[PDB]
Amino acid sequence: NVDVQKTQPRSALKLYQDLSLLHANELLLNRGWFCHLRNDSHYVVYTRELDGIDRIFIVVLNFGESTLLNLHNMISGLPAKMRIRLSTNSADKGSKVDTSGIFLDKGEGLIFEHNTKNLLHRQTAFRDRCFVSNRACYSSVLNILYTSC
């Protein structure tokens, strides 16, 4: 029920509340590009990007059973260790996993925040799998959005 899940830190209501808060406070989630990778029987991996903002979100969702992931073989230029922004098990918030082996339980989802300037929608090998509505770039010196890409 609602009342018992307001006082539990690992409840479904708490994960819903900070997923909708993160969606409201981040231009990458409510406005940014959507770039999906290749298909896989276990997991779904995609990114949320925006030009002028020099960090990305990497979403890893395991829909199969328990598997291990090598994220180096999907995205080029990642560090050896990545910090978790949000997890379906909220005990793993702010923890660091290693990029070469990421262990995912059944039904586990992770959101990574990665500082980079390598956006997938600028490369020609990923442009066919990238999508936007209301295309804009971000100017960090003026704090505006502009359309002259």
Binding site: Y16, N89, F131
Partner: protein, 100 residues
């Protein structure tokens, strides 16, 4: 209960206005979940809808079985994470945020 090429026609034309979006229930129709089956639902909507239109996503509703009974309790948290990291408008049926 419609084909994706007929659902996309409710977006209209670039010179003729129609619905802001047609409601997407294709994730609600998944009675079992998998990496390939979630991929084909996401890529069917993004490839078929017109360029520059706004997408939307639902995982349940009043005529669909509830998600923890449809897929299991282990998929409640990851289906909510999928709903809020995809582009467009997330639509939540009541009680899904609790796991009813």
């Amino acid at each position: 209960a419609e084909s994706i090429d007929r659902t996309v026609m409710y977006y209209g034309l670039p010179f003729i206005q129609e619905a802001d979006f047609p409601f997407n229930n294709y994730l609600s129709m998944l009675d079992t979940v998998s990496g390939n089956s979630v991929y084909e639902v996401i890529t069917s909507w993004m490839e078929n809808m017109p360029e520059g239109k706004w997408p939307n996503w639902m995982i349940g509703g009043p005529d669909s079985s509830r998600l923890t009974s449809r897929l299991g309790n282990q998929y409640v948290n990851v289906m909510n994470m999928l709903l809020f990291t995809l582009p467009g408008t997330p639509i939540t049926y009541y009680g899904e945020e609790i796991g009813m």
